[PDB]
Nucleic acid binder design. Structure first.
Lengths: 116, 48, 80, 86, 51
RNA sequence: CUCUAGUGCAGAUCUUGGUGGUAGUAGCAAAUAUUCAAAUGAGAACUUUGAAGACUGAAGGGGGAAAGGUUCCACGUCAACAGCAGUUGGACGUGGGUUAGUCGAUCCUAAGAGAUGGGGAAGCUCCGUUUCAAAGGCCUGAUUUUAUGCAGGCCACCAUCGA
RNA sequence: GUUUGACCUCAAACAGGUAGGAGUACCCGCUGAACUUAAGCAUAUCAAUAAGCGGAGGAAAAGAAACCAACCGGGAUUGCCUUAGUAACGGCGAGUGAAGCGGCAAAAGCUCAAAUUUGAAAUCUGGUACCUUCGGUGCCCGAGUUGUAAUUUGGAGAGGGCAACUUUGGGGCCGUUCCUUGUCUAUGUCCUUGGAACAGGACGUCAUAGGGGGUGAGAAUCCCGUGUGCGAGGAGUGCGGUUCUUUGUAAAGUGCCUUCGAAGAGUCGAGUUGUUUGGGAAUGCAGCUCUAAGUGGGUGGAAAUUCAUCUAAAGCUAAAUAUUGGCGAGAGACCGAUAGCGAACAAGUACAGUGAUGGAAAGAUGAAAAGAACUUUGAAAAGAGAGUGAAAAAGUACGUGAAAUUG
RNA sequence: AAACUUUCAACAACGGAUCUCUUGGUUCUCGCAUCGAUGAAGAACGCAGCGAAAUGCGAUACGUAAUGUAGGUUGCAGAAUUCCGUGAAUCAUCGAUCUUUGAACGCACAUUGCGCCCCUUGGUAUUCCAGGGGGCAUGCCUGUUUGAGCGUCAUUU
């Protein structure tokens, strides 16, 4: 209901079906103007960009997507380590926007199923 | 004493739990204290 | 339940196979003296005399697998 | 991984006799892996060939069982009427 | 408030006549729900749905 | 712009906890002397080793059962923690070792008690077990085998449980 | 000797199915108390309940007249509003305290006999024999038709047969509804101070959806969702419509002919007690023991007597209603780590008690961990330069910070 | 005399409140509403590149299978290994799953230990054990094989 913690309850112990969707980020403007869709879920080999933030409007990709954590590693947002290893580094995917959507087998038929 | 059958693995369970507090605990918290309440000491508590 | 898990192959089983004959085993718990001996006899390929039992405070029952004279000891233990 | 469920059901009893014995031949290696430190790229194949060979063997039991006759005996089809006691 | 038991005892040990510690009782006072001046006992006017 | 409630703190030898107080004071564990040299080291009265003495020897020697249950052991650490130091510990952490027909784990008698069924009676429970029961010998019939095993007929002379 | 059988009393082993337990609340029944109040006080009263045990179910549990009104009239159980502190009881002291009538909600009714004394063609049953595997065959116990009527007695009130078939049921088909899966979620971009814009400034649209929460800062348009439309695939649990048999069997309506019927005894209640405060005390109700009639017996708070009214002592039945162990959604003048669920966090886990059990300490960086390379001093601790980064005036024991304590 | 003593200022230091916080309530409102011998709720002890250990699994062990869903590799995790880029595999369902042990249950016992009666199957010297399977004497109920007393008291001898 109207509740902070008890609304977050559903988000926290969300099933794996809902955790597909809750790996969310918006779509870019020429993806909306191509299709129609608001957001679509976020996966590994998508080209990404940072919306709100100091990392402002830079090019990136995603390295890893994680299931329970929700947070994704972002390629090109790269710092080192104390030992000196150039790693992709974490961000929560709300701070991101994807520029790639693939066509594939029948994601082609997902986005244009019965409603679309 | 002479031990029976179903005493032995209750005692084995107790001496297995005589190991330290799990080290996974303060990877979730990081540093901040989480203290626990069981194990067994030899001088003090016996088993059930 | 069922009888045999595996041998226990620490440095202790490398004492009592060179000198004192046996293969030290760590089987299941309700696996008695008769059951363990004939189960070794079919499985491993060795003839077996008195096989003994002892449970530690770890809960697991050991078995003391004594062999016959025509068979070996070292080429009985190290086959796996 | 090893064999598979839906394939075992569509077998015949003449083939399932071979499945029982020849699947648990590799099981001898799996117990040796526990002793020599386990590792999932060898040790992971230890589960479903207990009942999945026996239940598909008991397809020939259950589908033949509806042609019995006598009195007395229970465990076969007797504890089926539990949620039909009322 | 009746989720603890704490008894009277008086002098001879370090607790009062007030039900503070007895059959348990850390910061859970009262025999039943007793002691509003005691913290974790009862309230003065415990609010009710009946009123 | 006005209506509503668990609505003003100094106190029942009270209540939730830290901190103050005597106080760095006493205590520092029943009067079985200790002296001297070394090994190792950052540090040595204490670990460990040598020289030497006090001391006990119907126990400071030896050694099993109940009860407990791996505390022994080797490996390994000096942080927390030991009425002090500390090179040390069962604290701390990890694994191993315990092989019986053979030493204990049974029948019947005592203290004493149990299991089961129906009744007397309001239950508890007492009672029945004492005749069958339980166990054994002899005879007959059908089936099968290297053997076997079963069913029927016949035998009065005994009957509760635990060191 | 010996030959041949029925009922009372009233068994044991093989062999298909069927079942155990873990649990909360709701109700009915039974052995069945008390702290207390009249400031006290054995019999008012805590009370037919706790606690313990038994019984029934998914709802429990009740009920269709041996009723009220009062000559005007009406007709089950159950819940609610009027009612009622009235009508009565209790040192008339605390206290307890109905019924009837009108209105509102949701309201349909049935199983047993001329008792019983009960037996066969066939129907048809509990147990059980042969066959020896639920299939085929046989006997006794027996239920009414039926083969066929009485016993103990009585009336003029009233019933039954016969014919036409129809409806229910069963079978077949369709429509409606429910469940599940699957999909589009509308509406948005610019500019600027800047570390980030959800503020401010500029221009539009959806809105049915502007409740909500999450989002690097205030949100309709950034996200998760919602309103609203759409693909079909299964199911009979409900509801509606249609079709077949008049169902070789069971009931009702319609129409015609001909003629006459009943009763449940350990109960009614009783010497006496009592589950009821026995008081003149109904009823509810039967301990010890016995015990009554169907133009006759019973309800209506004394009896003679009269009027209106009901017909037990066998049995069954829907809802208005009570309640939770599990799951989801929404909200209430409803908290923000001393509150509240035991517990927001490895809280039953370092621990303590033989012991269902008691049970503390306990929350925390940023955008990105990049969680300090490198250099230099000291023995580790500790002390300084230097880098990373938006800021290091964010340095890992990571918010704001006071005092005793303490320079 | 400012050590010992007291106050102020400047410069800080050992302790540490409250509130905005917050995958946690409470209370109230609407709609549905338990599992189990085919082995319940629950413990034991196994199953990783490295491993204290979350989380899943548990003699085809981070699963197991058919179909609709492009980049998979849960968590501490950085990294390493291995496969693919317009038909990798993700998620709902159905089917597979059911180690030991708890109702627990071959049976006594002090839960994760541990031994009896019977059948089947295998090996071996007659014998004994093993591989494995089952029940009111683990609750109840039925059929079949097949039993007795005694009376009102039978048919014939």
């Amino acid at each position: 209901s109207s509740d902070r913690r008890k609304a977050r309850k559903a988000y926290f112990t969300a099933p794996s079906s809902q955790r597909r969707v809750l790996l969310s980020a918006p779509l870019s403007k020429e993806l909306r103007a191509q299709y129609g869709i608001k957001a679509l879920p976020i996966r590994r080999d998508d080209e990404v960009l940072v919306v709100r933030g100091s990392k402002k409007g830079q090019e990136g990709k995603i390295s890893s997507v994680y299931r329970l954590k929700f947070a994704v590693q972002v390629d090109k947002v790269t710092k080192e380590k104390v030992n000196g290893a150039s790693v992709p580094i974490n961000l929560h995917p709300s701070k991101l926007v994807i520029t790639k959507l693939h066509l594939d087998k029948d994601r082609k038929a997902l986005i244009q199923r019965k409603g679309g | 004493a002479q031990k029976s059958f179903r005493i032995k693995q209750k005692m084995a369970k107790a001496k297995k739990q005589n190991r330290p507090l799990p080290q996974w605990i303060r990877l979730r918290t990081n540093n901040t204290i989480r203290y626990n309440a069981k194990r067994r000491n030899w001088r003090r508590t016996k088993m059930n | 339940y069922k009888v045999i898990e595996q041998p226990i192959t620490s440095e202790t089983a490398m004492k009592k196979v060179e000198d004192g004959n046996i293969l030290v085993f760590q089987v299941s718990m309700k696996a008695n003296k008769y059951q363990i001996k004939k189960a070794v006899k079919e499985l491993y390929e060795v003839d077996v005399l008195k096989v003994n039992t002892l449970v530690r405070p770890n809960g697991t029952k050991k078995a003391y697998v004594r062999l016959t004279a025509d068979y070996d000891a070292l080429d009985i233990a190290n086959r796996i | 991984a090893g064999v598979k469920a839906y394939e075992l059901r569509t077998k015949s009893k003449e083939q399932l006799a071979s499945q029982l014995v020849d699947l648990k031949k590799e099981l001898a290696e799996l117990k040796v892996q526990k002793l020599s430190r386990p590792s999932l790229p060898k040790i992971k194949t230890v589960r479903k060939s207990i009942a999945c060979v026996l239940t598909v063997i008991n397809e020939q039991q259950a589908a033949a069982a509806a042609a019995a006759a006598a009195a007395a005996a229970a465990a076969a089809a007797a504890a089926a009427a539990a949620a039909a006691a009322a | 408030g009746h989720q603890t038991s704490a008894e009277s005892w008086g002098t001879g040990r370090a607790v009062a006549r007030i039900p503070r510690v007895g059959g348990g009782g850390t910061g859970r006072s009262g025999q039943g729900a007793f002691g509003n001046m005691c913290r974790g006992g009862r309230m003065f006017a415990p609010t009710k749905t009946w009123r």
